[PDB]
Amino acid sequence: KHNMKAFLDELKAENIKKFLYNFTQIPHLAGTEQNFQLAKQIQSQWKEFGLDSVELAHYDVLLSYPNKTHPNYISIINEDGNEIFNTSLFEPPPPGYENVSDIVPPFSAFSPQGMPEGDLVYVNYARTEDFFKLERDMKINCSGKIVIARYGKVFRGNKVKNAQLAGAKGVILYSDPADYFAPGVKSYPDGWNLPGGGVQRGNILNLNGAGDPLTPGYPANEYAYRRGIAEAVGLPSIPVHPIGYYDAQKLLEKMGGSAPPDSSWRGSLKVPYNVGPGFTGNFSTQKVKMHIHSTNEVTRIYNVIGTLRGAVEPDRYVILGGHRDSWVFGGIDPQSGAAVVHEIVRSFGTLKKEGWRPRRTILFASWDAEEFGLLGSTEWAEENSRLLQERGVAYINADSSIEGNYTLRVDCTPLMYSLVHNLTKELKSPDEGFEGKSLYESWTKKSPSPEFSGMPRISKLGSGNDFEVFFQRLGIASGRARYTKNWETNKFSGYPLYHSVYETYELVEKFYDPMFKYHLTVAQVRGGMVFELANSIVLPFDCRDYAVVLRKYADKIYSISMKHPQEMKTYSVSFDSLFSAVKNFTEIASKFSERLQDFSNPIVLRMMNDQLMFLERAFIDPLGLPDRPFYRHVIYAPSSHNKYAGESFPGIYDALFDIESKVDPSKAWGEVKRQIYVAAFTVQAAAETLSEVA
Amino acid sequence: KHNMKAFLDELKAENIKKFLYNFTQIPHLAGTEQNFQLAKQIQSQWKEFGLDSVELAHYDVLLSYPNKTHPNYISIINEDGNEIFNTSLFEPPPPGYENVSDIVPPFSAFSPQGMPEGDLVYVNYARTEDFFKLERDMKINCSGKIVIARYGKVFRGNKVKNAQLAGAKGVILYSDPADYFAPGVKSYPDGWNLPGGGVQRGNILNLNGAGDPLTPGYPANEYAYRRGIAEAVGLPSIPVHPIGYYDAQKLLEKMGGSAPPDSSWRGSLKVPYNVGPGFTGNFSTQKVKMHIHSTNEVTRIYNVIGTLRGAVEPDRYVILGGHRDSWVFGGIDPQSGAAVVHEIVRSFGTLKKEGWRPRRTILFASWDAEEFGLLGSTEWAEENSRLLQERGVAYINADSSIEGNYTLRVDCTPLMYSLVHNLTKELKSPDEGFEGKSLYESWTKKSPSPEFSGMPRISKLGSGNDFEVFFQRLGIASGRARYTKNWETNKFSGYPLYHSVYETYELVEKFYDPMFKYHLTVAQVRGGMVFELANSIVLPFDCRDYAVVLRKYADKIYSISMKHPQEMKTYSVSFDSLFSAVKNFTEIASKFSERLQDFSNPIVLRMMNDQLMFLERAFIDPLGLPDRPFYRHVIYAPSSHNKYAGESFPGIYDALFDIESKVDPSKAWGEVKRQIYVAAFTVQAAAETLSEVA
Ligand SMILES: *[C@@H]1O[C@H](CO)[C@@H](O[C@@H]2O[C@H](CO)[C@@H](O[C@@H]3O[C@H](CO)[C@@H](O)[C@H](O[C@H]4O[C@H](CO)[C@@H](O)[C@H](O)[C@@H]4O)[C@@H]3O)[C@H](O)[C@H]2NC(C)=O)[C@H](O)[C@H]1NC(C)=O
Ligand SMILES: *[C@@H]1O[C@H](CO)[C@@H](O[C@@H]2O[C@H](CO)[C@@H](O[C@@H]3O[C@H](CO)[C@@H](O)[C@H](O[C@H]4O[C@H](CO)[C@@H](O)[C@H](O)[C@@H]4O)[C@@H]3O)[C@H](O)[C@H]2NC(C)=O)[C@H](O)[C@H]1NC(C)=O
Ligand SMILES: *[C@@H]1O[C@H](CO)[C@@H](O[C@@H]2O[C@H](CO)[C@@H](O)[C@H](O)[C@H]2NC(C)=O)[C@H](O)[C@H]1NC(C)=O
Ligand SMILES: *[C@@H]1O[C@H](CO)[C@@H](O[C@@H]2O[C@H](CO)[C@@H](O)[C@H](O)[C@H]2NC(C)=O)[C@H](O)[C@H]1NC(C)=O
Ligand SMILES: *[C@@H]1O[C@H](CO)[C@@H](O[C@@H]2O[C@H](CO)[C@@H](O)[C@H](O)[C@H]2NC(C)=O)[C@H](O)[C@H]1NC(C)=O
Ligand SMILES: *[C@@H]1O[C@H](CO)[C@@H](O[C@@H]2O[C@H](CO)[C@@H](O)[C@H](O)[C@H]2NC(C)=O)[C@H](O)[C@H]1NC(C)=O
Ligand SMILES: *[C@@H]1O[C@H](CO)[C@@H](O[C@@H]2O[C@H](CO)[C@@H](O)[C@H](O)[C@H]2NC(C)=O)[C@H](O)[C@H]1NC(C)=O
Ligand SMILES: *[C@@H]1O[C@H](CO)[C@@H](O[C@@H]2O[C@H](CO)[C@@H](O)[C@H](O)[C@H]2NC(C)=O)[C@H](O)[C@H]1NC(C)=O
Ligand SMILES: N[C@@H](CCP(=O)(O)C[C@@H](CCC(=O)O)C(=O)O)C(=O)O
Ligand SMILES: N[C@@H](CCP(=O)(O)C[C@@H](CCC(=O)O)C(=O)O)C(=O)O
Ligand SMILES: *[C@@H]1O[C@H](CO)[C@@H](O)[C@H](O)[C@H]1NC(C)=O
Ligand SMILES: *[C@@H]1O[C@H](CO)[C@@H](O)[C@H](O)[C@H]1NC(C)=O
Ligand SMILES: *[C@@H]1O[C@H](CO)[C@@H](O)[C@H](O)[C@H]1NC(C)=O
Ligand SMILES: *[C@@H]1O[C@H](CO)[C@@H](O)[C@H](O)[C@H]1NC(C)=O
Ligand SMILES: *[C@@H]1O[C@H](CO)[C@@H](O)[C@H](O)[C@H]1NC(C)=O
Ligand SMILES: *[C@@H]1O[C@H](CO)[C@@H](O)[C@H](O)[C@H]1NC(C)=O
Ligand SMILES: [Ca+2]
Ligand SMILES: [Ca+2]
Ligand SMILES: [Cl-]
Ligand SMILES: [Cl-]
Ligand SMILES: [Zn+2]
Ligand SMILES: [Zn+2]
Ligand SMILES: [Zn+2]
Ligand SMILES: [Zn+2]
Residues B533 and B548 in one domain: no
Q: Are strands A287-291 and A73-77 parallel, antiparallel or unpaired?
A: antiparallel
* B370 catalytic per annotation: yes
- CB-side neighbour CA atoms (13 Å) of B56: 18
Which residue has a Cα nearest atom 6 of ligand 13? Answer: A405
Nearest CA to ligand 5 atom 12: A597
Residue ranges with strand state E in A217-333: 240-243, 287-291, 295-308, 313-323
- In the three-class reduction of DSSP (H, G, I as helix; E, B as strand; rest coil), residue A498 is classed as coil
Q: In B, which residues are within 8 Å of A607 by CB distance? A: 314-315
Sheet holding A287-291, edge to edge: A83-86, A73-77, A287-291, A117-118
Q: What is the 3-state secondary structure (H, E, C) of A23-85?
A: HCCCCCCCCCHHHHHHHHHHHHHHHHHCCCEEEEEEEEEEEEECCCCCCCEEEEECCCCCEEE
Catalytic residue among B385, B418, B574, B593: B574
Helix/strand number for chain B, H first, E second: 20, 19
Alpha-carbon Rg for chain A in angstroms: 25
Sign of CA dihedral A157, A163, A165, A169: negative
User: Three-state DSSP class for B271?
Assistant: coil
Answer with the one of A497, A525, A540 that is the final residue of a domain: A540
B80 and B101 part of one domain: yes
Please say which residue of A484, A508, A540 terminates a domain: A540
β-pair type (A117-118, A287-291): antiparallel
Structural domain including A73 reads 67-292
For residues A641 and B554, what is the distance between their CA atoms, to the nearest angstrom? 46
Select from B224, B239, B199 the least CA-distant residue to B64. Answer: B239
Judge if B427 and B301 occupy the same domain: yes
Which of A215, A364, A389 is the mutation pick for testing B, counting most B CBs within 10 A?
A389
Sheet holding A360-367, edge to edge: A53-65, A295-308, A360-367, A313-323, A392-397, A477-484, A407-412
Nearest to A604 by CA among B614, B311, B604, B534: B311
What residues pair up with A411 in beta bridges, in sequence order?
A459, A480
A503 vs A334: CA distance, rounded Å: 10
Distance (Å, whole) CA A685 – CA A27 = 48
Whole-number Cα distances in Å, A407 to A13, A340, A444, A474, A515? 18, 17, 9, 31, 16
Q: Are the CB atoms for A312 and B603 separated by under 8 Å? A: yes
> Of the candidates A153, A50, A170, A190, which has an alpha carbon nearest to the alpha carbon of residue A119?
A170
Cis peptide before A334, with omega less than 30 degrees from 0?
A: yes
- Alpha-carbon distance of A10 to A428, in angstroms, equals 15
DSSP three-state, residue B505: helix
CA distance B219 to B215: 7
State whether B164 and B245 are in the same domain.
Answer: yes
CB-CB neighbours of A606 under 10 Å = 20
What is the spatial distance between Cα A176 and Cα A181, in angstroms, rounded to a whole number?
Answer: 8
Q: Under an 8 A CB cutoff, do B315 and A607 touch?
A: yes
8 Å CB contact between B529 and B482:
no
| Peptide bond just before B277 cis, omega within 30 deg | yes
Whether residues B558 and B469 fall in one domain: no
Would you call B362 an interface residue with chain A, using a CB distance cutoff of 8 Å? no
Ligand 23 is a single-atom ion; what residues have CB below 5 A from it? B 333-334, 399
Q: Is A371 annotated as a binding residue?
A: yes
Helix A13-23 with A335-353: angle, nearest 10 deg: 130
Between the alpha carbon of residue B171 and those of residues B33, B174, B239, B251, the distances in Å are: 31, 10, 6, 13
Omega into B242 within 30° of 0, i.e. cis? Answer: no
Mark which of A489, A510, A540 sits at the end of a domain.
A540
Q: How far apart are alpha carbons A131 and A144 in whole angstroms?
A: 15
What residues sit around ligand 17, an ion, with C-beta below 5 angstroms?
A 211-212, 215, 220, 382
Q: Are B177 and B268 in contact (CB under 8 A)?
A: yes
- Using CA atoms, how far residue B135 sits from A193, B130, B275, B642, B667, in Å, is 75, 9, 12, 20, 25
Contact B446, B360 (CB under 8 A): no
A218 to chain B: which residues are within 8 Å by CB?
677-678, 681
At B647, which CATH number?
1.20.930.40
**Closest listed residue to residue A78, CA positions, set A285, A318, A306:** A285
The identity of residue A55, as a single letter, is: E
Q: Are residues A634 and A527 in the same domain?
A: no
Looking at the DSSP bridge assignments, the partners of residue A459 are: A411
Residue B242 shares a structural domain with residue B154: yes
Does A317 contact B at CB distance below 8 Å?
Answer: yes
Look at chain B and report how many structural domains it folds into. 3
CA A469 to each of CA A14, A231, A578: distance values in angstroms, whole numbers, following the listed order? 33, 22, 27
Output the CA–CA distances (angstroms, integers) from residue A283 to A168, A169, A280, A553, B378, in the order listed.
Answer: 21, 21, 6, 52, 69
Residue B350: CB atoms within 10 A of its CB come to 16
A616 lies in the same domain as A536? no
Helix (H) or strand (E) holding A202: strand A202-203
Is A333 annotated as contributing to ligand binding? yes
> In 3D, which of B305, B261, B21 has the Cα closest to residue B129?
B261
Question: Which residue spans within B240-342 are E strands per DSSP?
Answer: 240-243, 287-291, 295-308, 313-323
SS3 A106: coil
- B633 is known as an active-site residue: yes
Does an H or E element contain A480, and which? Answer: strand A477-484
- In the chain, the amino acid numbered B496 is P
How, if at all, do strands B477-484 and B407-412 pair?
antiparallel
Closest CA to A56 of A41, A45, A40: A40
> CATH number, domain at A81?
3.50.30.30
Q: Are A320 and A304 spatial neighbours (Cβ–Cβ below 8 Å)?
A: no
* Same domain (yes/no): B222, B193: yes
What is the distance in angstroms between the CA of the first residue and the CA of the last residue of chain B? 40
CATH number at residue A424: 3.40.630.10
Which residues does A117 contact at the CB level (< 8 Å), separation at least 6? A77, A287, A288, A289, A290
Same domain, A218 and A136: yes
Return the ∠ at Cα B264 (arms to B137 and B238), rounded to 5°: 65
Q: How far apart are CA A461 and CA A635, in angstroms?
A: 10
Kindly report whether the peptide bond that precedes residue B189 is cis, defined as omega within 30 degrees of 0: yes
Same domain, A192 and A260: yes
b/e string for B436-470 if b means 16 or more Cβ within 10 A?
eeebbbbbbbbbeeeeeeebbbbebbbbbbbbbbb
Q: Are A131 and A164 in contact (CB under 8 A)?
A: no
Same domain, yes or no, for B53 and B91? no
B610 catalytic per annotation: yes
The closest of A211, A233, A215 to A224, measured between CA atoms, is: A215
Rounded to the nearest 10 degrees, what angle do helices B417-426 and B439-446 cross at? Answer: 120
Cβ-based neighbours of A144, under 8 Å, separated by 6 or more = A118, A167, A168, A169
Resolution for the entry shown, Å: 1.7
Where is chain A discontinuous (C–N over 2.5 Å), named by the preceding residue?
A: 599
Torsion sign (Cα): A238, A244, A247, A251: positive
- Give the method used: X-ray
Q: Please check whether residue B230 touches A, CB under 8 A.
A: no
